[PDB]
């Protein structure tokens, strides 16, 4: 929370960083980005979507039952 210097304690850890003018802007943005987005999609839709298909069923069923209540008359 404070400034740098007195936060943690690390022993021997080596970090390499390349220059930004040295390397490309988008490293393989259409050969790894598509498998990464399909992987992150496949690892989340089974936990996100089965409530939303229930919401879609509730919306359609409520529309159909309101039309059921009003389309006899």
């Amino acid at each position: 929370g404070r400034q740098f210097g007195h936060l943690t304690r690390v022993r021997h850890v080596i970090t390499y960083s390349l220059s930004p003018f040295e390397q490309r802007a988008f490293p393989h943005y259409f050969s790894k980005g598509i498998p990464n987005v399909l992987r992150r999609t496949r690892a989340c839709i089974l936990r996100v979507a089965p409530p939303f298909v229930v919401f879609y069923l509730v919306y359609t069923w409520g529309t159909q039952e309101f039309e059921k209540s009003k389309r006899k008359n």
């Binding site: 943690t8 304690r9 022993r11």
Partner: peptide, 13 residues
């Protein structure tokens, strides 16, 4: 001449 940054963090020195 690449130009980069290497850091070897060792907090016990």
């Amino acid at each position: 001449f690449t130009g980069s940054e290497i850091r070897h963090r060792e907090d016990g020195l």
